[PDB]
């Protein structure tokens, strides 16, 4: 199916505790493939020239981000006392044919959106007056054309290569293993919990229906969570009146399943 | 493949 490559970058200042820590992690879908940290199978196949080029770009990125953090403190009239965070997230999305669906290149400062490259890969959206300064500088320096070139070229090219080299895991969707548990809360009510375990990728839809009606408001949904062995887990629960369990159906949709599942409590 | 960042904010 469709695939994505993304790098998730975090630069964090720490006044009095050295220079800002910089970490860049690379993913193909929900699979981390690389980590570069200033505090430090299918990928090692690449060779030394690949490694040397990536580590050198990472070192350059660390210096650019350290200077951006200095600039940001000034743009927001902040003191040198506090810790601040600049985040960058970029990459490409491709369809089954490996063709570009869209590119991404965005930034956040202190957890707030700062500036982002638009879907057109030519123009910027600045969140505030400080980001309008960055937009003006980046328009003058033709930064979008450089980012576009990576997003349309390099990103798609390398993503295609990684999917070929890592085909046995990257191209394999592992279906959820599912079951429904029953937990009496009182003599009048019980919790029905619908489980999904060992699935990949993380994207999944878990729902409960009562008489074929979606129970969106009465369903407790936990966030999808990593198991630690590449797979993910999720559960959805509903509180049901004792004896009415059979009116409830859990519905599961996932890429690894040819047909969705409909599950009920099986006493 | 990592992308270079040469322009500061």
């Amino acid at each position: 199916g469709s695939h994505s490559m993304r790098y998730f970058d975090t630069a964090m200042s720490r006044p009095g505790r050295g220079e800002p820590r910089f970490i860049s992690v690379g993913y193909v879908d929900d699979t981390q493939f690389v980590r570069f940290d200033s505090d430090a199978p299918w990928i090692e196949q690449e060779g030394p020239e690949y490694w040397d080029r990536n580590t050198q770009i990472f070192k350059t990125n660390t210096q650019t981000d350290r200077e951006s953090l200095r600039n940001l403190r000034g743009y927001y009239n902040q003191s040198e006392a506090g810790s601040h965070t600049l985040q960058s997230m970029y990459g490409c999305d491709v369809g089954p044919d490996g063709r570009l669906l869209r590119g991404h290149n965005q930034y956040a400062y202190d957890g707030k959106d700062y500036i982002a490259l638009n879907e057109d890969l030519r123009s910027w959206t600045a969140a505030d007056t400080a980001a309008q300064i960055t937009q003006r500088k980046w328009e003058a320096a033709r930064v979008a054309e450089q980012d576009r070139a990576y997003l349309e070229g390099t990103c798609v090219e390398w993503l295609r290569r990684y999917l070929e080299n890592g085909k046995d895991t990257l191209e394999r969707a592992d279906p959820p293993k599912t079951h429904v548990t029953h937990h009496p809360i009182s003599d009048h009510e019980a919790t029905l919990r619908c489980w999904a375990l060992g699935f990949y990728p993380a994207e999944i839809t878990l729902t409960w229906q009562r008489d074929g009606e979606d129970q969106t408001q009465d369903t407790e949904l936990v966030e999808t969570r990593p198991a630690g062995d590449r797979t993910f887990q999720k559960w959805a629960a509903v509180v049901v009146p004792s004896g009415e369990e059979q009116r409830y159906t859990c519905h599961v949709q996932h890429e690894g399943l040819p047909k969705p599942l409909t599950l009920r409590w099986e006493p | 493949q990592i992308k270079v960042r040469v322009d500061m904010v």
Binding site: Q32, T85, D110, G111, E223, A227, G228, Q233 | -
Partner: protein, 100 residues
């Protein structure tokens, strides 16, 4: 500045079976800023060698980390995760419940 408190889940890698080796996880997510303290507890006491995932974040910029250790569950042993963050007045403790 704007801060986001961590969401916390404590669970096992594989379905829990008393006496069978598994992995105890504590997934912290949705937080900002990134500094966080996470401990895995066995009967109220800190577990020594706990590993963690590399710092990453979601589409909404909030951070997430997985803390994990190899453990063998039993009927008697109690497990928990103790999290501290700038948003929390005191450490938040979440018990491991094999049904969650």
């Amino acid at each position: 500045m704007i801060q986001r408190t961590p969401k916390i889940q404590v669970y096992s890698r594989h379905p829990a079976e008393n006496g069978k080796s598994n992995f105890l996880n504590c997934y912290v997510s949705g937080f900002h800023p990134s500094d966080i303290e996470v401990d895995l507890l066995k009967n109220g006491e800190r577990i020594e060698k706990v590993e963690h995932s590399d710092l990453s974040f979601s589409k909404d910029w909030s951070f997430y980390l997985l803390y994990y250790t190899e453990f063998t569950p039993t009927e008697k042993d109690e497990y928990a995760c103790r999290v501290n963050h700038v948003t929390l007045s005191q450490p938040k403790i979440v018990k491991w419940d094999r049904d969650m």
